[PDB]
Design a binder for this molecule. Sequence first.
Ligand SMILES: CCCCCCCCCCCCCCCCCC(=O)OC[C@H](COP(=O)([O-])OCC(O)COP(=O)([O-])OC[C@@H](COC(=O)CCCCCCCCCCCCCCCCC)OC(=O)CCCCCCCCCCCCCCCCC)OC(=O)CCCCCCCCCCCCCCCCC
Ligand SMILES: CCCCCCCCCCCCCCCCC[C@@H](O)O[C@H](CO[C@H](O)CCCCCCCCCCCCCCC)COP(=O)(O)OCC[N+](C)(C)C
Ligand SMILES: CCCCCCCC/C=C\CCCCCCCC(=O)O[C@H](COC(=O)CCCCCCC/C=C/CCCCCCCC)COP(=O)(O)OCCN
Lengths: 459, 606, 156, 178, 128
Amino acid sequence: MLKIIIPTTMLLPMTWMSKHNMIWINATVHSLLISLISLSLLNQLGENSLNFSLTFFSDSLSAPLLVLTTWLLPLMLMASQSHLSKETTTRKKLYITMLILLQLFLIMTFTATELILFYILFEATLVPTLIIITRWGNQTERLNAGLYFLFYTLAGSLPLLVALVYIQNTTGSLNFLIIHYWSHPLSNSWSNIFMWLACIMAFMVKMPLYGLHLWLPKAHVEAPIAGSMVLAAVLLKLGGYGMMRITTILNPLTNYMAYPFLMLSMWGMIMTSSICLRQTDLKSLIAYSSVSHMALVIVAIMIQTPWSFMGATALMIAHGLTSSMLFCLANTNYERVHSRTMILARGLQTLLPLMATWWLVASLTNLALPPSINLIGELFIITASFSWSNITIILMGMNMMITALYSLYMLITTQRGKYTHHINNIKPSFTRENALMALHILPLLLLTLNPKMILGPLY
Amino acid sequence: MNPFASLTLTTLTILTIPIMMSNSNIYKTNLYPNYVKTTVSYAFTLSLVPLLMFMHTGQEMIISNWHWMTLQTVELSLSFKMDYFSVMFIPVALFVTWSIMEFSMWYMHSDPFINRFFKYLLLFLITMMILVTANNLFQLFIGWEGVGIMSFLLIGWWHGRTDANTAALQAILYNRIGDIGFVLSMAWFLTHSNAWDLQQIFMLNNECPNMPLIGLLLAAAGKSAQFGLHPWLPSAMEGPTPVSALLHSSTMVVAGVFLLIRFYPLMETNKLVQTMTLCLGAITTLFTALCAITQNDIKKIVAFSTSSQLGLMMVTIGINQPHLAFLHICMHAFFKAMLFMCSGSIIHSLNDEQDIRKMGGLYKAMPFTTTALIIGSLALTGMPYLTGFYSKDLIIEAVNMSYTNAWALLMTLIATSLTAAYSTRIIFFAFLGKPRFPPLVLINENNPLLINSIKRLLIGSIFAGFIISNNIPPMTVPNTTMPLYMKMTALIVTIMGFMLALELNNTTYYLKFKYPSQTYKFSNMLGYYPSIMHRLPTYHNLSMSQKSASSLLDLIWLETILPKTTSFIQMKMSIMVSNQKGLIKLYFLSFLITIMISMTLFNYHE
Amino acid sequence: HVTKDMFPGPYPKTPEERAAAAKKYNMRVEDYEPYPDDGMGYGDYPKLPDRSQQERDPWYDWDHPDLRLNWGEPIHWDLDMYIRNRVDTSPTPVSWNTMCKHLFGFVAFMLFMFWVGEIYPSYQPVGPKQYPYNDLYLERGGDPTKEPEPVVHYEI
Amino acid sequence: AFSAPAAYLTHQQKVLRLYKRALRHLESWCVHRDKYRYFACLMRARFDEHKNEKDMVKATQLLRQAEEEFWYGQHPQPYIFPESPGGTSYERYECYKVPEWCLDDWHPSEKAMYPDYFAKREQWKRLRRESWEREVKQLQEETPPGGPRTEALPPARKEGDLPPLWWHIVTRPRERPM
Amino acid sequence: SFPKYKPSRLATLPATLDPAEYDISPETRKAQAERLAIRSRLKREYLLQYNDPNRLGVIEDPALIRWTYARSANIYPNFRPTPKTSLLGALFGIGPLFFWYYVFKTDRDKKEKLIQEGKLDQTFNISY
Ligand SMILES: CCCCCCCCCCCCCCCCCC(=O)OC[C@H](COP(=O)([O-])OCC(O)COP(=O)([O-])OC[C@@H](COC(=O)CCCCCCCCCCCCCCCCC)OC(=O)CCCCCCCCCCCCCCCCC)OC(=O)CCCCCCCCCCCCCCCCC
Ligand SMILES: CCCCCCCCCCCCCCCCC[C@@H](O)O[C@H](CO[C@H](O)CCCCCCCCCCCCCCC)COP(=O)(O)OCC[N+](C)(C)C
Ligand SMILES: CCCCCCCC/C=C\CCCCCCCC(=O)O[C@H](COC(=O)CCCCCCC/C=C/CCCCCCCC)COP(=O)(O)OCCN
């Protein structure tokens, strides 16, 4: 796996030893090359994972996440080099260093063989994102957003550290393969209930679970574009990956310890989709979309069925790509009008037709239009939940209705009606923004032809 | 191989070539609409051959040519069903689409984005073929959603108009409501039957339970605009007249009826679902026909006529006569599309005027439009030997000769009378009398495109019923023995409708004025259903979404409990700890207290 | 360029505070009335007539024609719910509580009469249809290893 | 749409508005032309029956009763002109209306096409630039110190002056821009 | 005479049927004059920036900023725990959760009892 880690580390000396007018070109080109190299990890086996060494491995669930993480950095570099034009060379190189460190931490997180190294890197990902949000954010609320984002995660995950250390003392190891082969049930005790809670909330905070999501509308809105993209696309999926990994130790306590979380998520998807219907901020609407979509992944993980696991993996990938595209689309308008209000700049289809097409495609993908991979994941989870309980279909259908409602509401408000008379500084769409939109959207449609690559190990 | 499979796949794959050429140097030329129309005509000509093969030997196939993914036991493949319904419906849809595109070349002549309009129409046709020819539930869902999204994109064609966007979103909502039931049916058929394919579903379900069929009924009611979910179809008249003629008149709105027809082997074994479908169809065909008889916008009248015909189709399905419903779909397509083309010709010739109250004597001004619309109304009203006689009169006869809900029977008969009632109104207020339009006469129907496009479906509306009904094999036991008074029920009620509507219309010439009654207000305002259901539930939902979900729960109490409480507690504890004035006299006494406590508490019991 | 005094604040309790708030929102003191001082967080913000945007004069030359708002005028709290792409409160020719009565009565009457007709169906004076081979026992599923009860039909 | 509104409507304006509205709704009820002529002459007689009363209280009560009459007897589906706020073609062409400032964002290759039009546009822009301060000065001269009382704008009083705030009224896109 | 129209929340009272415009006072005329003066001053202030050739940027609207700030950031500082507030919050936050928990728990208990007696007709149920 070092053939991907070492180039990502070498990205840093190349960035720092580059000329002031050549940093973006080198960073983008070599990030794209690293993504091409990482594409080789999709060649998974049918029975067991790819055990590269004692430290790293790769399975059918880690490979799509790794490919998405490697593919995302070029897009963040593309989207960042517009509003960082007036920066100094040192500050630009520091921003790129933070992004590269984030990629390296995520890459080593998704392939860590043990749970302690996984925890170490899973929390090492906090400092670069926190620095990005609190340093290159635009408004004065970025400090509060950073505090919320840091403390929710740490308060949720310190008990996870305690529980993991206890598990290693009682079992002898925290290697995932040994744990999976030597699995043993939990007795229905209070101590086991609290050890279940400690091993679960660390990932529920980062999904986020409904009621524990307050940090997300702050962090995703106050962060710069690259920070928002990495928060929505990859950092939300760490909780899902960790849960699908760690429920191996948990059974059978999950059969009844998952009731409050299932209720919270299936009602919170409705609540967040309804919140999306009255939002004066576009970025906040896109942020709440993420909670509404990740509640379904929480359900799929909690019900413990192969179809739910496959749907959860597909939905995580599709949500990452779609949310990144939507955030980029909103940033394109923000860089024009310098405001986040939705009704400020309206009727933008008349002025920017190709961005209108991109908006339409992103909105169609968000509302899970067949045969999108969004639809594949959501329908698989819906079928699994119907098998779990037939009455879940009411909530699933209502959520599907409200999702399309607010998606087309966001499309029509921003792109239709008559253009505001006074915004006379709307320049034509740049080649960079169109290329960003295309590189976001083409993989989504291409993944429909080979959906087994993003369906996980249960396929 | 025999030509059946190759031709059936080719007639679908050659409809996508103009979509691929949408980025070439034909899309930036005024030749593109002609190119698309020629492609559609060639596709119709090619598809005419598998129909002939089925007409000869009843040859039918399923074609699973591509394997998509395998999830454990289940196999999802690109499978096409080329049975009687598909091979009979594709040529009719292609013929109607060819006529509508030739009409669009004239009606959308001054549109700056006509090429885009043609691309959109083609996309809708492709999605409809995908829906119709689908063999598995996932492919049929793909078509189901594609036709809905194309409806959304074509209703809001003039995206500067607020009401077009409102109507498009309304259609999307009313179709998602039935999409809920579609997803219910898919989930039930997958967990219970372990397959999404039609062959497996039929085999494993010899006595089908309620849930999947009720989900299918909900989806069909959403798509076909039944009484619960009806109002979106009349609102869908915001888009251009060709869109209303092609999508919301003859091809899209029959998708729910088609879905219910495809699952008739499972609906044969359920009687409660059949009763529900019968009642829903009867109430829809009554209510929309009652709403149509007081409408002044011609497009709204024809939309309500379409909704009433869809209700009649659902009635036909609900009496265990699905082949009659498919036949009625095929017959109704012709003359209803022709009626919309005539109405659009009238609208274009009167400078975008849609109200019949400003339409006067057009019987002599537009002779061909009047002839076409008279023939269409006669076909629509089940005039004997017209294309509508071979379907609608047989439907009425079957409903009379069945173990049927009596209220549904009476409602169907009253709707049959109201059809002639509203049809008379369009003719009376549109073609008879003295002119009521502005004096600058711009009337002109001497365009070969309009004439030929209308004439093709005119010949169709005249001869298609006889041509088709005598050529399909018999899949129905007939009603050979009937009393004479019941054999002529439909004709009698249509004649009574004609006479009563004509009398009440002729009453308008009298120099007498009177204020409207409450029945007229109920009928004209669509039963107040949009006046209530478009204001009360929407207001309550949008107010709870902000007052409760956004403000009270998310911004106040979820903030209060976890972060604000801990912040307050830490602030209070920090203040409590940090305010000592630095006087040794106090904390040395505290040291003494601590020392004393330690000895007794922790020392005297080790 | 909005400084500290131009933002909404807490509920005004004295006449001077109410006058200052009315000046802030470009309103007449005789027209300015905030929401009731409960714990909903409305605070300083003014309460305006719950009129929709469809009721606003369409022939006035607004600064924003589609929204039907002027530039500096105060904005309703629920503007995004009354954007006239949404909930409409315009007067109707028929009064409320009368539209509801007629619609509910029509729906209930239709349901009741459908139930009544289900209780009293309509059929023809004929006997049940007869099928030859043991009521098509083999064709309706098969099971040829039980020799079912033979049903026999006679000419009449 | 072109006139600055007043603070309130006078009694005469309200009566005229009601007369026009009642005539329109009666025409909606009376589809045929001769019947509408008959009942419109009757309507004119009904309005002229009370035109000469000098008592304002009774006239206002008559107006109230007339408004109640109209609201009870109005047509639920009155005729609307196609381009009217309720018409079927009200905002059909608003997506084709592009503001004039978008022409400054064109590529030089696009402006190579249509050179004469862009020369005329350049001289129009020069004319707009040369007149702004005079318009501002006239506006700040002819208004009361306590802010304007009406939305009405003054004309150009001198010879080298253009009416103040004219650019966006003169450079409307079109009704049919395409 | 004729049946009277009564306004509602979603069908409001027309201006022509509202008595306030048929009993007018000089106070009302003064109020209307001042309202028109305010609107005219705001319109002039907007149009002066709108027609300026020199400016090339979005024109700031303090009303929109006030609206968004009040709807988003100004809510918590003006929040007081009151009986109505606490009751509404507790209901809308907790009641649905326990309602759905009860429904799903009863449904799954019934299904499990049916499984333990072998009565669901679970043939062909393979994918779960
Ligand atoms: C074969 C043996 C069996 C024989 C069967 C019978 C034989 C023949 C019998 C003939 C009987 C009369 C047929 C004509 C009916 C009346 C025609 C008519 O329009 O008269 C106008 C007249 C007044 O009109 P207007 O307001 O002065 O019009 C103003 C302008 O002229 C406006 O002018 P415009 O330009 O807008 O034009 C208006 C337009 C629209 O006209 C209207 O405004 C009225 C339209 C609605 C009535 C149409 C009949 C529909 C009946 C459906 C009933 C379904 C059950 C509903 C249950 C609801 C329960 C709540 O005019 C038309 O559409 C033409 C008239 C209708 C043409 C079709 C007539 C024939 C079909 C019906 C008879 C079928 C005969 C064969 C049957 C075969 C099988 C038995 O109203 C009526 O006469 C109809 C009233 C009957 C329904 C009343 C329902 C009760 C309402 C209040 C109930 C109490 C509620 C208490 C509160 C409860 C709250 C919960
Ligand atoms: C804002 C939202 C953020 C996320 C919140 C997550 C919620 C976490 C809660 C997880 C639920 C499980 C916790 C305890 C398990 C069962 C609780 C209890 O109701 O079960 C009964 C237990 O009976 C009594 O209720 C004992 C519990 C009483 C003390 C708990 C009070 C908690 C009420 C409020 C909790 C608030 C949670 C959030 C804290 C901030 C069952 O009776 P019994 O079969 O005999 O005992 C089974 C346990 N055995 C097997 C070990 C013996
Ligand atoms: C942003 C908010 C998130 C906050 C999450 C905080 C709650 C996390 C869940 C519980 C955390 C503490 C659990 C302890 C860590 C696991 C240790 C373990 O598993 O071993 C247990 C230890 O069990 C315990 O000691 C439990 C101690 C619990 C005390 C602290 C309670 C804190 C509050 C509990 C509820 C919080 C969980 C949900 C809250 C969600 C946020 C509102 C077995 O004990 P033994 O020594 O083996 O004895 C048995 C054999 N003789």
